[PDB]
Amino acid sequence: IVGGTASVRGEWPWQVTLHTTSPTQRHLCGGSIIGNQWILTAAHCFYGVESPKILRVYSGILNQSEIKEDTSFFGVQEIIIHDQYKMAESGYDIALLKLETTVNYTDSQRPISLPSKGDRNVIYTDCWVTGWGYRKLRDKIQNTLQKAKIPLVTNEECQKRYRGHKITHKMICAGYREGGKDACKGDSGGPLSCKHNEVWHLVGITSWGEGCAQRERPGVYTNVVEYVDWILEKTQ
Numbered sequence: 033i034v035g036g037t038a039s040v041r042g043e044w045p046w047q048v049t050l051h052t053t054s055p056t057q058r059h060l061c062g063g064s065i066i067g068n069q070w071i072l073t074a075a076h077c078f079y080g081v082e083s084p085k086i087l088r089v090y091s092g093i094l095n096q097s098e099i100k101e102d103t104s105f106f107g108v109q110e111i112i113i114h115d116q117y118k119m120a121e122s123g124y125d126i127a128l129l130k131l132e133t134t135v136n137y138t139d140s141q142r143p144i145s146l147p148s149k150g151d152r153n154v155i156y157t158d159c160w161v162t163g164w165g166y167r168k169l170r171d172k173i174q175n176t177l178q179k180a181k182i183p184l185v186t187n188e189e190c191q192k193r194y195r196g197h198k199i200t201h202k203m204i205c206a207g208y209r210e211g212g213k214d215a216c217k218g219d220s221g222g223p224l225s226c227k228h229n230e231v232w233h234l235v236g237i238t239s240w241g242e243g244c245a246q247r248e249r250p251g252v253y254t255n256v257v258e259y260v261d262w263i264l265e266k267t268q
């Protein structure tokens with residue numbers, strides 16, 4: 033996250049750090065807890081990933097440095113990628129991880145609700161991107177989960193910013209006209225979380241964008257409400 037501030041323990045308890053262990057252990061992507069055995073993440077995250085056997089899901093982490101040889105983690109039983117996924121920029125950048133066991137929800141690991149049936153109308157004015165990514169292009173993965181408030185922009189404005197890409201209704205765009213705050217390298221797969229009526233909804237998944245927090249170039253996020261039937265199909 034560029035222009036972001038450190039978060040506190042328990043603040044974004046649906047957030048996960050997904051690690052690879054091949055050829056060495058490191059943060060791969062962010063993720064959101066949506067069910068006791070279910071993580072929602074980005075499809076492009078598994079580009080180099082031979083099978084679910086090398087993946088670890090770490091819940092309840094503020095700082096990446098807490099993850100020791102004995103920090104418990106969740107195994108991944110399955111990686112379900114949307115069947116129309118090709119590259120992130122052309123959409124369908126959505127995947128589910130089935131954990132090998134159920135999450136017991138605590139103050140440090142909770143589910144985030146999907147956008148509600150009946151709220152397709154809603155204008156979300158309180159949206160936040162979280163993660164452990166670079167604070168600029170060319171940087172490193174950050175130790176403390178970061179947070180940053182970012183405004184949604186219309187799909188019409190976003191298309192005018194990316195005239196070389198097809199910006200469709202299954203994408204949602206977020207960023208400041210001036211730049212400054214946005215997701216960056218290492219934040220993909222994580223949530224764009226919006227509070228509506230004091231309930232937090234998983235409105236987008238960090239996907240792609242041109243540069244990190246440049247002016248007139250919003251972040252592009254998988255539009256979660258357009259995939260709720262796909263998620264429910266796969267998670268029932």
Ligand SMILES: O=C(O)Cc1ccc(NC(=O)[C@H](Cc2ccccc2)NC(=O)CCc2cc(Cl)ccc2-n2cnnn2)cc1
Nearest residue numbers: 060076077215216217218219220239240241243244251252
């Ligand atoms: O190895 C390391 O140093 C740590 C390390 C760990 C993860 C990553 N991740 C990435 O490069 C992934 C795309 C990607 C994910 C997984 C596999 C391949 C590509 N991209 C992102 O996370 C941010 C994408 C992104 C999303 C949004 Cl909404 C806006 C801007 C951007 N960026 C534009 N230029 N850079 N970022 C980078 C470095």
